[PDB]
Design a binder for this molecule. Structure first.
Ligand SMILES: O=c1ccn([C@@H]2O[C@H](COP(=O)(O)OP(=O)(O)O[C@H]3O[C@H](CO)[C@H](O)[C@H](O)[C@H]3O)[C@@H](O)[C@H]2O)c(=O)[nH]1
Ligand SMILES: OC[C@H]1O[C@@H](O[C@H]2[C@H](O)[C@@H](O)[C@H](O)O[C@@H]2CO)[C@H](O)[C@@H](O)[C@H]1O
Ligand SMILES: [Co+2]
Length: 278
């Protein structure tokens, strides 16, 4: 059916990494033919899902900007369902959605520690994949709420398993990655090992793969807590361990999740999504 040559040309971005040793593309602005993919996926009649959690003061503020920008830039041309997880549903703001967009809201019990809020996402996402999302969408993205779409974030990002390159580390040496380095943690990665440092603010894939991502991360979170240890960067450490062992079939460049606090080097041609201030 579809082959990499049909839509992806790595040679259009020669100054950056565009392919991995396991044959996965790194999608940079200029390398992809979105028109070919729009037509390809429209034939298939796909629906894309997007989960976001919002707890505490995050609820009304970031969520409005996130959803407003998402409705504007996320997978335009194809049906989308927004899955919104909140602790108090009263905080859910009213965002008018465009054609073929809808949403569902669920009330979640907020955890005590800010670290468990972020990590408990993994369990909750898996539960809703089994309960309904596996029957509602063909691809699924899970995103932090404290970020904002800036340009088209389209079907060029879809794949079996999708990882995001952390903007601060994509040109760094693996020995400088902030992996979990304690052998006692399930997320342990030795020095000299690792392909990239992936950002936990964006990951996706088919519901099947996302279930495995979130189930395996959650089990590592669980094993760690039972040994009274918490990974350096919590779920992100476990996600990086997971993608080390289970290579993503597609990687998104830092253009798809950029921190302007870095600046704007020549590598970043067109930002599709940017961090919010932390
Ligand atoms: O009080 C809270 C805490 C967390 N969150 C949710 O958890 C996400 C992660 O928290 P932050 O965005 O505040 O922190 P970071 O930018 O440091 O998050 C990054 O590091 C985390 C681990 O520390 C996770 O790996 C996360 O996926 C990754 O984007 C938020 O986007 C939000 O969706 C809330 O809604 N409210
Ligand atoms: O290292 C993972 C961690 O990165 C944070 O980003 C830091 C970055 O690591 C640091 O080099 C730079 O000086 O400041 C950035 C902003 O604090 C992310 O904020 C965090 O979520 C993790 O992804
Ligand atoms: Co964040």
């Amino acid at each position: 059916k579809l082959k990499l040559s049909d839509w992806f040309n790595p040679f259009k971005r020669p100054e950056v990494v565009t392919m991995t040793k396991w044959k996965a593309p790194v999608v940079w602005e200029g390398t992809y033919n979105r028109a070919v993919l729009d037509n390809y996926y429209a034939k298939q009649k796909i629906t894309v899902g997007l989960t976001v959690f919002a707890v505490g003061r995050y609820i009304e503020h970031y969520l409005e900007e996130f959803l407003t920008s998402a409705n504007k830039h996320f997978m335009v041309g194809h049906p989308v369902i927004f899955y919104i997880m909140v602790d108090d549903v009263s905080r859910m703001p009213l965002i008018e959605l465009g054609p073929l967009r809808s949403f569902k809201v669920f009330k979640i019990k907020p955890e005590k520690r800010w670290q468990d809020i972020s990590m408990m996402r993994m369990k909750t996402i898996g539960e809703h994949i089994v309960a309904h999302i596996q029957h509602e969408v063909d691809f699924l993205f899970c995103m932090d709420v404290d970020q904002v779409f800036q340009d088209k974030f389209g079907v060029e990002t879809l794949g079996e398993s999708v990882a995001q390159l952390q903007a601060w580390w994509y040109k760094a040496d693996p020995n400088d990655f902030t992996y979990e380095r304690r052998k006692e943690s399930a997320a342990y990665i030795p020095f000299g090992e690792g392909d990239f440092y992936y950002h936990a603010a964006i990951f996706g894939g088919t519901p099947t793969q996302v279930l495995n991502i979130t189930q395996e991360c959650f089990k590592g979170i669980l094993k760690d807590k039972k040994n009274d240890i918490e990974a350096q960067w919590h779920d992100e450490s476990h996600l990086n361990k997971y993608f080390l062992l289970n290579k993503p079939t597609k990687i998104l460049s830092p253009e798809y999740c950029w921190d302007y606090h870095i600046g704007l080097p020549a590598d970043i041609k067109l930002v599709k999504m940017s961090w919010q201030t932390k």
